[PDB]
Amino acid sequence: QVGLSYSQTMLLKDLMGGIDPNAPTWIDIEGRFNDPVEIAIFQPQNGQFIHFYREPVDQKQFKQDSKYSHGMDLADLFNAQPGLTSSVIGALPQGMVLSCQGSDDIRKLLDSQNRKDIKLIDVEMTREASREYEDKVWDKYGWLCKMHTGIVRDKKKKEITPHCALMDCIIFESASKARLPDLKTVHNILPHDLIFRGPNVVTL
């Protein structure tokens, strides 16, 4: 598993400049803290965000998460750029404040990467209020992620909408402001050929 090369790291550092260290910022993940498969970091004031995927180590756990949460396909993640999660988290500005829904797992994730400097705000919303704009967000911004193709069921075995880290970020922002974001454009600072493996290269 070849991680980010030197040049890729320098590119990532440059691209991170497009993030406002002081602006409010959402973070959300799918998968457990020690084995995440999707990460999203969203700045609602200018539509700037970071979004990427990761191949899971525990395939047995991933199958369950898929069936009951994100509905992702392991086949789609095999081309994910290895080591991107550690690099991105390593590249985050010092002392940055991130907002989230359920900060237990994300805190463990940041700490595992020695980023105890990054602060987490648990915007504790009720499950009936947080998912109010679920349909509307998927409606307008669903084109940004097509990885959730599997069927997801709840306790009642009723088929429900899959969970996307990026959509969740926009969903939680909508609930916190009681309206969809007033944004002309949104933009992933990471390019496709950094999120996914590029052409083969000799790594030594």
Binding site for a copy of itself (CB under 8 A): 2-7, 9-10, 12-13, 34-36, 54, 83, 85-87, 89-91, 112-114, 201-204
Interface with Mg ion includes 173 (CB under 5 A)? Answer: no
Partners of 38 in the β-ladder: 30, 53
How far is C-alpha 125 from the geometric centre of its chain's CA atoms? 19
List 164, 171, 190, 194, residue binding Zn ion (CB under 5 A): 164
Q: In this structure, what token pair is assigned to residue 73?
A: 């396909």
Interface with Zn ion includes 189 (CB under 5 A)? Answer: no
Q: What H or E segment, with its residue span, contains residue 29?
A: strand 26-30
Q: Was 28 annotated as part of a binding site?
A: yes
Q: Which is nearer to Mg ion, 16 or 172 (CB)?
A: 172
Residue 145's binding partner among Mg ion, Zn ion, a copy of itself, none (Cβ under 5 to 8 angstroms by kind) is Zn ion
Per the CB < 8 A criterion, the answer to whether 50 and 88 are in contact is yes
Q: At what angle do helices 134-141 and 165-177 cross, to 10 degrees?
A: 120
Distance CA 154, CA 90 (A): 35
* CB 7, min distance to Mg ion, A: 27
Closest CA to 170 of 15, 25, 23: 25
Breaks (C-N over 2.5 A) in the chain follow: none
Interface with Mg ion includes 38 (CB under 5 A)? Answer: no
Distance CA 140, CA 23 (A): 23
Distance CA 203, CA 99 (A): 37
Query: Where in 4-63 is the site for Zn ion (CB under 5 A)?
Result: none
Residue 168's binding partner among Zn ion, a copy of itself, Mg ion, none (Cβ under 5 to 8 angstroms by kind) is Mg ion
List 4, 25, 28, 147, residue binding Mg ion (CB under 5 A): 28
Residue 34's binding partner among Zn ion, Mg ion, a copy of itself, none (Cβ under 5 to 8 angstroms by kind) is a copy of itself
List 19, 145, 152, 189, residue binding Zn ion (CB under 5 A): 145
Binding residues for Zn(2+): 38, 145, 148, 164
